[PDB]
């Protein structure tokens, strides 16, 4: 039931990986709840579930299609209090087929709208926004 946020990452983007599962990278491949536009690259915002490969990381964790969630975003978006947040870097977390995160600890900041949706990623986060 997420509110719209500017979409900062198209399908092609290669982002950083927070958690202790051992992946350095996450290369995005598709997005959950993407409909139908001709020629539009499907893109993901803060907060939301995706699909990904790891490009470098632990060798069992490579060449598979994992689900991830997106946690920081360098593209700017408007909070309703009337200012524009934007983080330093794009980053995400490797996740199970339910929606739970795989590896428990989360480095970096996280967004408000990650912690607002997903209960588990709120707890393990160091400091939100």
């Amino acid at each position: 039931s997420k509110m719209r946020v500017t979409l900062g990452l198209p399908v092609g983007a290669l982002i950083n990986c927070c958690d202790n599962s051992g992946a350095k990278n996450l290369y995005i491949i598709a997005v959950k709840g993407w409909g139908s536009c001709l020629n539009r690259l499907p893109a993901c915002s803060l907060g939301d579930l995706v699909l990904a490969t790891v490009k470098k990381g632990k060798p069992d964790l490579r060449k598979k299609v994992h689900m991830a969630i997106i946690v920081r975003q360098r593209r700017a978006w408007r909070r309703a209090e009337g200012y524009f947040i934007y983080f330093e870097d794009n980053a995400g977390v490797v996740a199970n087929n339910k929606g739970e995160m795989k590896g428990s600890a989360v480095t970096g900041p996280v967004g408000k709208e990650c912690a607002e949706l997903w209960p588990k990623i709120s707890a393990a986060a160091t400091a939100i926004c």
């Binding site: 001709l38 209090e81 607002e116």
Partner: protein, 369 residues
């Protein structure tokens, strides 16, 4: 052959043709339906667009923004009081509606009278001079017609743009319908408004959906891409800001549904746009419960392209356009509509820091003469 990948259409066919309309103010079309039940009231207004600024209000919706402080963009519209002048009966025929008889007031100002001339400076200014001596010798012959016949009645009102900071003077005349009960009492409502300024608080209220008529801001002759929203062609001999294929061979004719180059903007055009604040020109307009600092809703350095020192109204065309407002065609309740409005803070600050000009003077201190 079929299309390959079945995309939706570029642009609506609802609005066509895309050509500049023959009118500078919005003509209303379709007033709301009559309840012989309510008292008699006016169902429309005219005002001039100014500029828009954001405001802070507390949401009352379980959304996640319940009890939180949301900034919102908000247009100020300058609305000095519209002076009622005439009244118009309308017979209902099988062809359509049809005007039976227009009655007018005794004494119109030169504000209204400019509308009837294209050259005011030359003329001897004769408009309603034979009528004025005829009026003193009034029109209770011709008002008796409107009581006997005539399903519909409309007050002729007009603007006061000498009070506005447009360089105008000319003043738009406008029919506004009267929707209450009893065809006699509609005329008695109109008669007692003759040479009286109708203010905005008579018509509209805080927390009300209004349907806004106007004309869009012009861009001249624009191409397919801007005009219709079309894909730009790839990096193509001849050029690439255009459609490739108009049409199939047959029909041996270009169809009207295909998008072409032409006019964009200056189109006559909304519904459900909430009024936040009715104001007064008579200080503390932008002052609220929360901030308690003395302000007028002019921002510093004017509205760019200026002042406003009249009655106005906020709410959720180009600058200096005559908007018309309308009372909504059915009174609707959508939770979103019928909302408690609460304004914390109206902004009156190129890129402004300070809310007021004395606040700037405090910061910089004793400057150099």
């Amino acid at each position: 052959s079929h299309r390959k990948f079945e995309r939706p259409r570029h642009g609506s066919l609802g609005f066509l043709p895309r050509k500049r309309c023959k009118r500078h103010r919005g003509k209303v079309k379709a007033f709301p339906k009559d309840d012989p039940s309510k008292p008699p009231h006016l169902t429309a207004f005219m005002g001039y667009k100014a500029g828009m600024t954001h405001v802070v209000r507390e949401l009352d919706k379980g959304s996640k923004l319940h009890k939180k402080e949301i900034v919102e963009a908000v247009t100020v519209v300058d609305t000095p009081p519209m002076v009622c002048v005439g009244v118009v009966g309308y017979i209902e025929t099988p062809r359509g509606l049809r005007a039976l008889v227009t009655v007018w007031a005794g004494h119109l100002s030169d504000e209204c009278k400019r509308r009837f001339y294209k050259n005011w400076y030359k003329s001897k200014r004769k408009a309603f001079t034979k009528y004025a001596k005829r009026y003193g010798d009034k029109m209770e012959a011709e008002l008796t017609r409107m009581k006997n016949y005539c399903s519909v009645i409309r007050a002729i009102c007009h603007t006061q743009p000498s009070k506005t900071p447009i360089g105008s003077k000319k003043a738009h005349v406008m029919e506004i319908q009267v929707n209450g009960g009893s065809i006699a009492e509609k005329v008695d409502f109109c008669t007692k408004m003759f040479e009286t300024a109708v203010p905005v608080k008579a018509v509209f209220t805080e927390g009300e959906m209004i349907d806004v008529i106007g004309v869009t801001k012009g861009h001249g002759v624009k191409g397919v891409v801007s005009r219709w929203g079309v894909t730009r062609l790839p990096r193509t001999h001849r050029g690439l800001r255009k459609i490739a294929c108009i049409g199939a061979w047959h029909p041996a004719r270009v169809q009207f549904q295909v998008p072409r180059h032409g006019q964009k903007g200056y189109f006559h055009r909304e519904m459900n746009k909430k009024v936040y604040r009715v104001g007064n020109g008579a200080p503390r307009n932008a002052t609220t419960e929360s901030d308690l600092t003395e302000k007028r809703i002019t921002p510093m350095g004017g509205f760019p392209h200026g002042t406003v020192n009249n009655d106005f109204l906020l709410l959720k065309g180009c600058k200096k356009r005559p908007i018309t407002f309308r009372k909504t065609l059915v009174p609707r309740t959508t939770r979103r509509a019928l909302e408690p409005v609460n304004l914390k803070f109206i902004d009156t600050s190129g890129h402004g820091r300070f809310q007021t000009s004395e606040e700037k003077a405090k910061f910089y201190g004793p400057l150099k003469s």
